Design a protein around this ligand. Structure first.
Ligand SMILES: Nc1ncnc2c1ncn2[C@@H]1O[C@H](COP(=O)(O)OP(=O)(O)O)[C@@H](O)[C@H]1O
Ligand SMILES: [Mg+2]
Lengths: 173, 371, 173
């Protein structure tokens, strides 16, 4: 959502990756309205295999932080979301190969664009809703245990994460 | 430099933020939900606790527990999850470089603030700490120094009478009837029409009912005579599954137990002759300045018509020459926090913190001397 | 009250500062009866942030006299009123930002003029009542210890304070 839009592109390797995935998913969410670069279903399949590859690299980036974390009570909030990325990318790989061969065996009259490629948007926006909690649970695990040995070798200070303090809640109404 | 944190960790809602501001940066409910169903998909799991806001978007598969009941922290392992959530995940600060200003109700157990001191120093490692009273901070945020504060929240309601910065601790009254005992009375009073809400996740739906349709009648025995003669008081509400319920005279019968607590089986008097029995325990010279400065705080004092009802019921008890002015600000839900941002950002307050060096020469019993 | 009206405008720095603050307070006093230049709530907030600045300068001027006193037995009546004006201007700064956001979020219909801006007048009446005791406690400490070295460097004689002798009390009735 707009939480990824409240970050800056000059961050570390994880925020520059999590902002690329939201730019891919922004091409697919307006395909329900038809206001994007993806014209028909054959571009939604090529975009879903692109977000499933970028999401499979933050599984690798998140697990290096989970190995340098010394406290076993801290990784449990981080490994719970690295197992949801490993599932939602495996659905996006295989349920795009299914919709690839349905389009070839049946033609263009079978898939209708909207309300037919919505199985690829639903599996993609559930990957994005499980990728902003592995940059938030990884920001906690890299600054709460910053002074520990091993975490400082990753070179991830608290100023590298470009997240700001939240906005003031309204007092009335 | 090193702006203090003001964490008003009340029951039912947690309001946190930075000292010197005018609005909290973090308002989320104080619940820790755990899943009660059977997970079939591999990957959904290994996450047995949702805290705050994602335990209400994902309710319906969770059982929702409140760690603070009646102002007293009952679960000390779930209260550490909310403090860990409100520093790192919600405010995005590091507690090793900010002093925090906690907040507690009066007449609580002394081992309740003895363990808040132990947790913030030995687990979160804050540099300094201070535990304040709720109804003294809602006088800072009201522009006064004299007055009597009715602070109705979720666990307790209490009156603290203060005259020129001097509190009278023998006239501090405290009720355990509060807003969460109006939710549990609304669950019982709605079964007369057929609607039965049972579960812990269905109590958050009937809590949202009382925040939208409930109001306080100015004359109760007259309002019950016009709620039965016609159908002009009924209003409809739409449940999360699409069903529409209709509520008649249960709109004013639910906040009426603050003024008649015999509906819930309590023997105590209402909040209109608890705020009067604590004026009449103060000295006679200061009673004219407490009748005119009647501060109302907290979230349960936000019903439509609780100020016009309460002026009707103290003028029937006070003598006929005293004028009675009840101060209900429009932002009175966050009044305890705003006076916490006033006090922690004060120029003369900065020698009243309980520093970490002071915590070593004493035990956790230093908070009773310094506060 | 009418004690500030009995002082002359050609005095030293503290008398001319406490004469301006009573002119601001007299603009907020008649707003409770509606006979002042401040017409709505949005001018009371601008005046309350003005009296909280002029009152924050007499905390500076009052502490140049409190440190030049030789012994600690005479400034106890001066520091007790300098700490009250430290609180009453911190309330006037923060509870003017709070009533500016409530006026901005909910609109102009939430504030009602009278019985809504009374949280700023009540915190300013207590500032003025604790700043005329700061003039009187500084007048005593400037003439009781005039001949001591350090107090004469401020150039504050007893003739600079333009306070006169009080009136005769009535004998009968
Ligand atoms: N509009 C409203 N009408 C009635 N009760 C309300 C309203 N808004 C909030 N509440 C009640 O206020 C309480 C939460 O506000 P607050 O006093 O800040 O809680 P707490 O003191 O537990 O932190 C809850 O009991 C809630 O039901
Ligand atoms: Mg409260």
């Amino acid at each position: 959502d707009a939480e990824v839009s409240k970050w800056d592109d000059s961050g570390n390797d994880i925020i520059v990756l999590a902002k690329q995935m939201c730019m891919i998913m922004m091409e697919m969410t307006d395909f329900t309205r038809g206001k994007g670069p993806l014209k028909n279903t054959s571009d939604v399949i090529s975009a879903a295999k692109k977000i499933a590859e970028a999401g499979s690299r933050m599984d690798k980036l998140g697990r290096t932080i989970a190995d340098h974390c010394p406290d076993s009570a801290c990784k449990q909030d981080l490994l719970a979301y690295l197992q949801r990325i490993a599932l939602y990318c495996h659905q996006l790989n295989i349920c795009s190969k299914v919709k690839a061969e349905v389009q070839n065996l049946g033609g263009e009259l079978v898939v209708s664009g909207v309300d037919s490629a919505m199985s690829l948007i639903q599996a993609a926006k559930n990957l994005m809703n499980a990728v902003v909690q592995t940059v938030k649970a990884s920001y906690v695990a890299s600054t709460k245990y910053q002074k520990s040995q091993g975490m400082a070798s990753l070179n991830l200070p608290a100023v590298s994460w470009k997240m700001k303090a939240p906005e003031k809640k309204p007092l009335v109404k | 430099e090193t702006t203090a944190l003001v964490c008003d960790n009340g029951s039912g809602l947690v309001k946190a933020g930075f000292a010197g501001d005018d609005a909290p940066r973090a308002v989320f409910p104080s619940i820790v939900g755990r899943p009660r169903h059977q997970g079939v998909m591999v990957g959904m799991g290994q996450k047995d606790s949702y805290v705050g806001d994602e335990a209400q978007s994902k309710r319906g598969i969770l059982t929702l527990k409140y760690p603070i009941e009646h102002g007293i922290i009952t679960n000390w392992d779930d209260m550490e999850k909310i403090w860990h959530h409100t520093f790192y995940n919600e405010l995005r600060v590091a507690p090793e470089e900010h002093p925090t200003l906690l907040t507690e109700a009066p007449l609580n157990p002394k081992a309740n603030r003895e363990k808040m001191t132990q947790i913030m120093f030995e687990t979160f490692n804050v540099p300094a700490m201070y535990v304040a009273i709720q109804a003294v901070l809602s006088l800072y945020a009201s522009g006064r120094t004299t007055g009597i504060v009715l602070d109705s929240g979720d666990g307790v309601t209490h009156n603290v009478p203060i005259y020129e910065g001097y509190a009278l601790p023998h006239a501090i009254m405290r009720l355990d009837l509060a807003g969460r005992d109006l939710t549990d009375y609304l669950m019982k009073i709605l079964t007369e029409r057929g609607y039965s809400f049972v579960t812990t996740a269905e109590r958050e739906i009937v809590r949202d009912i009382k925040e939208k349709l409930c109001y306080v009648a100015l004359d109760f025995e007259n309002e019950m005579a016009t709620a039965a003669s016609s159908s002009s008081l009924e209003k409809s509400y739409e449940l999360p599954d699409g069903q529409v319920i209709t509520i008649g005279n249960e709109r004013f019968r639910c906040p009426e137990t603050l003024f008649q607590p015999s509906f819930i089986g309590m023997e105590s008097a209402g909040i209109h002759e608890t705020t009067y029995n604590s004026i009449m325990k103060c000295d006679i010279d200061i009673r004219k300045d407490l009748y005119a400065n009647n501060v109302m705080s907290g979230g349960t004092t936000m019903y439509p018509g609780i100020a016009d009802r309460m002026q009707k019921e103290i003028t029937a008890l006070a003598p006929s020459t005293m004028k009675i002015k009840i101060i209900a600000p429009p932002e009175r839900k966050y009044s305890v926090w705003i006076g916490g941002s006033i006090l922690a950002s004060l120029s003369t307050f900065q020698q009243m913190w309980i520093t970490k060096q002071e915590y070593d020469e004493a035990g956790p019993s230093i908070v009773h001397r310094k506060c």
